[PDB]
Coordinates of N, CA, C and O and ligand atoms in Angstrom, one line a residue:
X1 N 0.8 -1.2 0.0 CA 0.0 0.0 0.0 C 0.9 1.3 0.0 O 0.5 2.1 -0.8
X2 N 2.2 1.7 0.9 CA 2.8 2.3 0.9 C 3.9 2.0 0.0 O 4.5 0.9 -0.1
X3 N 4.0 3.5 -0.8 CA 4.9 3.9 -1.4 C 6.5 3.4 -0.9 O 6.6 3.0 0.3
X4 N 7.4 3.5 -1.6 CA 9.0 3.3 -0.8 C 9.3 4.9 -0.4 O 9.8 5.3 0.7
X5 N 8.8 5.8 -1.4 CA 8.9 7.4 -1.1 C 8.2 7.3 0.5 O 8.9 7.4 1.5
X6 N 6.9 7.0 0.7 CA 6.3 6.7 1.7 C 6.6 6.5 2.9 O 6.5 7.2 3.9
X7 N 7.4 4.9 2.7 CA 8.0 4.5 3.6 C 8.8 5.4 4.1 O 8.6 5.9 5.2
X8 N 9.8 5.6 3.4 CA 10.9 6.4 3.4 C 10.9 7.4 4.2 O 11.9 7.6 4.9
X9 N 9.4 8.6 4.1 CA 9.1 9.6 4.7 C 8.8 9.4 6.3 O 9.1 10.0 7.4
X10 N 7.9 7.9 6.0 CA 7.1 7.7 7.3 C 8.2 7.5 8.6 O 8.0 7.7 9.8
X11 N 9.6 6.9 7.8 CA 10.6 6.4 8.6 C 11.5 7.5 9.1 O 12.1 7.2 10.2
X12 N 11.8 9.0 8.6 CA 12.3 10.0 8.7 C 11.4 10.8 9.5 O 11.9 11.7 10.2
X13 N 10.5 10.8 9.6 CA 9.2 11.3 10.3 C 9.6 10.8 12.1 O 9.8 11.4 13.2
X14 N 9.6 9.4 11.7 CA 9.5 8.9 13.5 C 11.1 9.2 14.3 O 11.3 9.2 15.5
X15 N 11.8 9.5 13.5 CA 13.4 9.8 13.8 C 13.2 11.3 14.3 O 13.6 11.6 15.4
X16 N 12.6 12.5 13.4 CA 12.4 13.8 13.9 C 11.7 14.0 15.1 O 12.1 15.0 15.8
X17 N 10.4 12.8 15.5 CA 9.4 13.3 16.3 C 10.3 12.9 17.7 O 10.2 13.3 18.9
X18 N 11.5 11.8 17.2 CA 12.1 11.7 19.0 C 13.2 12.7 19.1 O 14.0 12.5 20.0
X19 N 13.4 13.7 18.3 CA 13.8 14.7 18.8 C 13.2 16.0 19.4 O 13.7 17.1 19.5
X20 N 12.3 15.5 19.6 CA 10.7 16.3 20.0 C 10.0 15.5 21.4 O 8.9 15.1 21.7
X21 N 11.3 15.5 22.2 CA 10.7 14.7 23.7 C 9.4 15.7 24.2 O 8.4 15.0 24.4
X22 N 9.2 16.8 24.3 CA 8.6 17.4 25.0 C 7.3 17.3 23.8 O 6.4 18.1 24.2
X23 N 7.1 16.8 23.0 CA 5.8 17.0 22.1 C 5.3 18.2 21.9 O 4.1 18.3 21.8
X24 N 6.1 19.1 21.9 CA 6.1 20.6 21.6 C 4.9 20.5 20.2 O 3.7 20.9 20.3
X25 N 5.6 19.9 19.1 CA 5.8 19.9 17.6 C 4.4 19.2 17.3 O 3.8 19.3 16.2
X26 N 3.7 18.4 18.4 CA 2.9 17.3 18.0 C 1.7 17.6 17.0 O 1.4 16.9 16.0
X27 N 1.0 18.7 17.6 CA -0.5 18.8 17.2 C -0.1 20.7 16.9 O 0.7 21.5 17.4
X28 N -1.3 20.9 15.4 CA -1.1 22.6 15.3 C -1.0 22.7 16.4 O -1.1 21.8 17.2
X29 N -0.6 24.1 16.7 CA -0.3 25.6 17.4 C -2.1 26.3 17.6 O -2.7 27.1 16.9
X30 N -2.4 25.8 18.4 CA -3.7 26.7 19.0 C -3.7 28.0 19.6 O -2.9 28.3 20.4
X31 N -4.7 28.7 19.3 CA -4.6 30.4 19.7 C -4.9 30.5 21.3 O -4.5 31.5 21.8
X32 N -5.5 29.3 22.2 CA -5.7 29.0 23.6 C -3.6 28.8 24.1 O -3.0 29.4 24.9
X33 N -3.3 28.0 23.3 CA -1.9 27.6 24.0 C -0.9 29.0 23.6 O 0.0 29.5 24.2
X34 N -1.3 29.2 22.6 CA -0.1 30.7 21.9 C -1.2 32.0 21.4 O -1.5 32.2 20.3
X35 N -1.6 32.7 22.5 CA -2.5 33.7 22.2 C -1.8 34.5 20.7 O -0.7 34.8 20.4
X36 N -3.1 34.6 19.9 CA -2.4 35.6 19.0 C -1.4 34.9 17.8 O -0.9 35.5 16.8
X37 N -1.4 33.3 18.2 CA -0.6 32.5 16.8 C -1.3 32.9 15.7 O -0.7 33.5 14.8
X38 N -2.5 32.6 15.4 CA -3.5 32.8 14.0 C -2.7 33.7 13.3 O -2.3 33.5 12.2
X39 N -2.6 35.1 14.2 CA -2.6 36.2 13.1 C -1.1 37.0 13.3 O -0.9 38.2 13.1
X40 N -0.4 36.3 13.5 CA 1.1 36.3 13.3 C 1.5 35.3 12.2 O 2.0 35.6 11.2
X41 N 1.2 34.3 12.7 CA 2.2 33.1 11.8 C 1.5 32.6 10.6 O 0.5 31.9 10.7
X42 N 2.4 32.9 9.1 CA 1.5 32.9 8.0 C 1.5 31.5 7.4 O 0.8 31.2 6.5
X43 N 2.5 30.8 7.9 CA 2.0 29.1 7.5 C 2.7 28.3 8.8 O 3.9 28.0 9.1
X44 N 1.7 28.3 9.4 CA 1.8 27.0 10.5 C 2.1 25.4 9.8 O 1.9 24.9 8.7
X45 N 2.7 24.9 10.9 CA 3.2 23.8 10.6 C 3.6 22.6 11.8 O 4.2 23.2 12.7
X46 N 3.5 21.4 11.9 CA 3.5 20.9 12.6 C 3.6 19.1 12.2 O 3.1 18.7 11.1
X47 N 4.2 18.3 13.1 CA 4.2 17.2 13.1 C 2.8 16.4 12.4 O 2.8 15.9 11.3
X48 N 2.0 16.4 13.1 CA 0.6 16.1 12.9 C 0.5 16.0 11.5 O 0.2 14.9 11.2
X49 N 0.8 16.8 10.4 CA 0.2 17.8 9.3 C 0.9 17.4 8.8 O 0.6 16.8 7.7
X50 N 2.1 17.4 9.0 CA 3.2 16.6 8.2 C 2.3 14.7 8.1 O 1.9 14.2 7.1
X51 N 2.4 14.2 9.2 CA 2.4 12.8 9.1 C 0.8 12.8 8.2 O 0.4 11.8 7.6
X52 N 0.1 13.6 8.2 CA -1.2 13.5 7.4 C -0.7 13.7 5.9 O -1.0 12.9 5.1
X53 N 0.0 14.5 5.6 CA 0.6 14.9 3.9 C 1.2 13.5 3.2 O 0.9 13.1 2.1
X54 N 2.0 12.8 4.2 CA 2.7 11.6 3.9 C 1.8 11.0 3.7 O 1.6 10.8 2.5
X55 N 0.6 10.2 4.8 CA -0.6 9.4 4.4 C -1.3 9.6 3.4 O -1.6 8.7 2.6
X56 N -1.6 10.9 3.3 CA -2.6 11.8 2.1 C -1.5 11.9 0.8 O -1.8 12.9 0.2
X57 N -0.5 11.2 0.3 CA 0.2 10.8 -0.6 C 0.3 12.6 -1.3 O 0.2 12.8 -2.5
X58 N 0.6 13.6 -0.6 CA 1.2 14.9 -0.6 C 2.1 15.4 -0.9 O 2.1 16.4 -1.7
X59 N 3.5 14.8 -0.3 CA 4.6 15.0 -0.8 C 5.2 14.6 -2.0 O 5.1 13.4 -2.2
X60 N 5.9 15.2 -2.6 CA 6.5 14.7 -3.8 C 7.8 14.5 -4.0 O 8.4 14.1 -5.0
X61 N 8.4 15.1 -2.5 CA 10.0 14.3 -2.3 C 10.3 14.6 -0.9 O 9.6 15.3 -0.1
X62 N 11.8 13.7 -0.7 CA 12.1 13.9 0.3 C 11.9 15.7 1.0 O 11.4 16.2 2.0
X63 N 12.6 16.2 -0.2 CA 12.7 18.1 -0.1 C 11.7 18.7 0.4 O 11.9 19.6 1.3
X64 N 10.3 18.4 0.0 CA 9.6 18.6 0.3 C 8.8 18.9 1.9 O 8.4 20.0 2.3
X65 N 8.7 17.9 2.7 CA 9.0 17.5 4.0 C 10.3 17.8 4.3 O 9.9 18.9 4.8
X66 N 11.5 17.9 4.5 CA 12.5 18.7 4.7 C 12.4 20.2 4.9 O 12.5 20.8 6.0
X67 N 12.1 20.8 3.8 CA 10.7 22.3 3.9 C 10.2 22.6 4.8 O 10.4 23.6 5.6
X68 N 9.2 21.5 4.9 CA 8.1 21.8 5.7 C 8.7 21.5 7.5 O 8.2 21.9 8.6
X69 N 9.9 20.8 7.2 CA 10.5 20.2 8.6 C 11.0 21.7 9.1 O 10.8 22.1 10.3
X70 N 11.7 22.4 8.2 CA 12.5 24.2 8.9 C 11.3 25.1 8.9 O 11.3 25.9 9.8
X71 N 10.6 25.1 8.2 CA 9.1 25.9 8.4 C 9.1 25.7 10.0 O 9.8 26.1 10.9
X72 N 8.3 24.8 9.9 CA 7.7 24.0 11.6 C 8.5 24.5 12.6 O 8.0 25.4 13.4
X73 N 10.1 24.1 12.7 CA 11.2 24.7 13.4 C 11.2 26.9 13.2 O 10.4 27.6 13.8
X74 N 12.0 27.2 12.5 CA 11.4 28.5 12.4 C 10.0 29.5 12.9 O 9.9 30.5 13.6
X75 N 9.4 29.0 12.3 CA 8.0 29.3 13.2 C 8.2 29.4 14.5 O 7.6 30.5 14.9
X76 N 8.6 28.8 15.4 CA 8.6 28.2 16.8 C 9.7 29.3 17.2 O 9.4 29.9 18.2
X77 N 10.9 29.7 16.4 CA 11.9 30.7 16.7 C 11.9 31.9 16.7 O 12.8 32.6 17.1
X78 N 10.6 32.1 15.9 CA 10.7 33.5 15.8 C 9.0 33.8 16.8 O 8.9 34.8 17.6
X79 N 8.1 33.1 16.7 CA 6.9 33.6 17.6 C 7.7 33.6 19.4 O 7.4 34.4 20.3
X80 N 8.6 32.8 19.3 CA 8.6 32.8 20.8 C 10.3 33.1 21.1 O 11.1 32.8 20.2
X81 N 10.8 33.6 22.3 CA 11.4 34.7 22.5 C 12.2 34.0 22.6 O 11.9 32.8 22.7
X82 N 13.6 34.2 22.4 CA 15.1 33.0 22.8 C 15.1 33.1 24.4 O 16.3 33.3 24.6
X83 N 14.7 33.0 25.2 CA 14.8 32.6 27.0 C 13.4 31.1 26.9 O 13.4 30.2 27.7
X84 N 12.6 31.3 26.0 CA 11.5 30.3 26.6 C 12.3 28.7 26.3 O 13.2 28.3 25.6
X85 N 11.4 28.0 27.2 CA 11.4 26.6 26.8 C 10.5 26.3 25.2 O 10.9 25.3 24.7
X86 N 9.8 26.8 24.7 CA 9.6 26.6 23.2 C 10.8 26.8 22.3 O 11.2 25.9 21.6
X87 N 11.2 27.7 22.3 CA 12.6 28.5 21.3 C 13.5 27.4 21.8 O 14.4 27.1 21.0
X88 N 13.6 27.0 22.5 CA 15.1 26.4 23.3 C 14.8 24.5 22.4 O 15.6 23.9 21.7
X89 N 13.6 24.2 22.7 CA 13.2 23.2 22.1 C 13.2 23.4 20.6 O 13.9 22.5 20.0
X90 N 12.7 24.1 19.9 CA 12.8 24.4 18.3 C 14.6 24.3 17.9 O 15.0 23.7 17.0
X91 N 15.3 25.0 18.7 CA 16.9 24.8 18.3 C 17.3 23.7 18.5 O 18.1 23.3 17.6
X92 N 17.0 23.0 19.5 CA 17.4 22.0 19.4 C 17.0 20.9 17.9 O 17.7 20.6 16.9
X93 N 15.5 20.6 18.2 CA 14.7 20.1 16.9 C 15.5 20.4 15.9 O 16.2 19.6 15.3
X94 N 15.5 21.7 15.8 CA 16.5 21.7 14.3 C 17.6 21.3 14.0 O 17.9 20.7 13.0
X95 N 18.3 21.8 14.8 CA 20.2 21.2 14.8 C 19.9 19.6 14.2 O 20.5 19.2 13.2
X96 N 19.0 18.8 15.2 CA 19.0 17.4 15.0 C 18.8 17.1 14.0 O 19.8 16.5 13.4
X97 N 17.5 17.4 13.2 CA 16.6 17.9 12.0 C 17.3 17.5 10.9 O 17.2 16.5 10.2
X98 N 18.1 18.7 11.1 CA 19.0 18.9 10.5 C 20.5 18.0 9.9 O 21.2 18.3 8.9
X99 N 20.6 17.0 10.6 CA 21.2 15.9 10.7 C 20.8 14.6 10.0 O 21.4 13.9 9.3
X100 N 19.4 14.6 10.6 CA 18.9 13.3 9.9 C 18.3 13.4 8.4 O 18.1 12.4 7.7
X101 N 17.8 15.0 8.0 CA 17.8 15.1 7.0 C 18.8 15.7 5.9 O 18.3 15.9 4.8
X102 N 20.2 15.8 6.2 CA 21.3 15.9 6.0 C 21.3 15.9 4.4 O 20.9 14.9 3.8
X103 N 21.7 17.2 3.8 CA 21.6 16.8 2.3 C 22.7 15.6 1.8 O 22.7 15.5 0.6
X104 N 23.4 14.7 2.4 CA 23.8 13.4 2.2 C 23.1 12.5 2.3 O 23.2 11.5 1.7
X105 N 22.2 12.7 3.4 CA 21.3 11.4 3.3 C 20.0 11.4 2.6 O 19.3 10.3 2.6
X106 N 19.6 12.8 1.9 CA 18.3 12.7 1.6 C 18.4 12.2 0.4 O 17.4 11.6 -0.1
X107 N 19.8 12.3 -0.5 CA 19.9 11.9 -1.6 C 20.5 10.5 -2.0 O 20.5 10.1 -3.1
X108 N 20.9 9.9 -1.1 CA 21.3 8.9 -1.2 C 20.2 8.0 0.0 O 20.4 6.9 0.5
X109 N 19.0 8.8 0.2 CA 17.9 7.7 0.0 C 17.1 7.6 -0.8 O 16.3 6.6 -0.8
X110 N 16.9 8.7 -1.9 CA 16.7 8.8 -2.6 C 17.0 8.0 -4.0 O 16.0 7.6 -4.6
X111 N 18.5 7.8 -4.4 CA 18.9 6.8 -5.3 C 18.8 5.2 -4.5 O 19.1 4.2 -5.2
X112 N 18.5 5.0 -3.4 CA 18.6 3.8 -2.8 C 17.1 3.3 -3.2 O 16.8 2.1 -3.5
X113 N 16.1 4.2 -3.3 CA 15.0 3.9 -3.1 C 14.8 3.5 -4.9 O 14.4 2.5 -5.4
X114 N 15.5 5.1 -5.8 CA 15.5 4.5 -7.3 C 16.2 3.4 -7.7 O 16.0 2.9 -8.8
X115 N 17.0 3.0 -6.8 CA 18.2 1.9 -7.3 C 17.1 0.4 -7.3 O 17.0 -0.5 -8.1
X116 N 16.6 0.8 -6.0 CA 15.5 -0.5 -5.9 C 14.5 -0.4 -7.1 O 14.3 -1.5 -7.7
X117 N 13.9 0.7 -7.7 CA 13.0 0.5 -8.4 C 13.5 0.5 -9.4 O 12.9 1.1 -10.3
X118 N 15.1 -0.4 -9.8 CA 15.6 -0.1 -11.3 C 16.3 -2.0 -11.0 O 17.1 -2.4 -11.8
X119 N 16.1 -2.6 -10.1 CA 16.5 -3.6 -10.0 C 15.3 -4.6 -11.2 O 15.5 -5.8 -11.3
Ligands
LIG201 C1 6.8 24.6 19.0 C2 5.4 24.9 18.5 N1 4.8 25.4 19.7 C3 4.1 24.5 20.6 C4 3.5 25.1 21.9 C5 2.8 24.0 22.8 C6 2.1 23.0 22.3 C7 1.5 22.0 23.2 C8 1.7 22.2 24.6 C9 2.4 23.3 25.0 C10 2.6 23.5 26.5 F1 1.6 24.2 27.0 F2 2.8 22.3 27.1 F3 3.8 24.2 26.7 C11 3.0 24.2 24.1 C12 3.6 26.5 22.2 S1 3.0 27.4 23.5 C13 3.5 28.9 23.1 C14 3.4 30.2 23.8 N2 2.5 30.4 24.7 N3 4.4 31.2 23.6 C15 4.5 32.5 24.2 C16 5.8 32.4 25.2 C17 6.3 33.7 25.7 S2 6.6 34.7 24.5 O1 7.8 34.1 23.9 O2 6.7 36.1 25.0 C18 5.5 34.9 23.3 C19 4.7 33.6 23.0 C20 4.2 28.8 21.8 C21 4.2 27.4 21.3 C22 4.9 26.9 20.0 O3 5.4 27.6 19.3
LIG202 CL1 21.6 15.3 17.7

């Protein structure tokens, strides 16, 4: 049923979300938890939304979600102040992020996954 792009994503996905112990990232950004998010932040983004795009066969490459992965991060850096525990958690997220989507590895899972589909 799933794609190898799919897989691929679904498996890059669960690697991001455990650098997200605090489940900061989990679910949108609600205007009750972050007064005033709506009408500041002009594309929200979040874990959730991500793992629905992947199911909802949305993405069209790794890059894609990668995108949408510094969106999510950013967002988080700029609404909230560098002293909070939100900002402090987004830097972190990213650095990691940043790692596992590593423009080395995104492309050479990418030819791994074409390599398969040329076998
Ligand atoms: C990282 C995305 N994100 C997530 C949350 C959030 C989500 C679920 C649960 C909780 C918590 F309540 F358990 F902590 C927080 C929040 S909450 C928030 C918020 N209220 N930020 C204010 C902190 C002081 S301020 O920096 O002056 C301005 C905004 C921003 C984010 C966010 O970006
Ligand atoms: Cl790390």
């Amino acid at each position: 049923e799933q794609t190898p792009l799919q897989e691929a994503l679904n498996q890059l996905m669960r690697q991001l979300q455990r650098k997200d112990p605090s489940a900061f990232f989990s679910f949108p950004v609600t205007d009750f938890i972050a007064p005033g998010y709506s009408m500041i932040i002009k594309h929200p983004m979040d874990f959730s939304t991500m793992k629905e795009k992947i199911k909802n066969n949305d993405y069209q490459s790794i890059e894609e979600l990668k995108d949408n992965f510094k969106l999510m991060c950013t967002n988080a850096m700029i609404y909230n102040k560098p002293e909070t525990i939100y900002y402090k958690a987004a830097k972190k997220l990213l650095h990691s992020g940043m790692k596992i989507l590593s423009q080395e590895r995104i492309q050479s899972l990418k030819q791994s996954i074409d390599f398969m589909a040329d076998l």
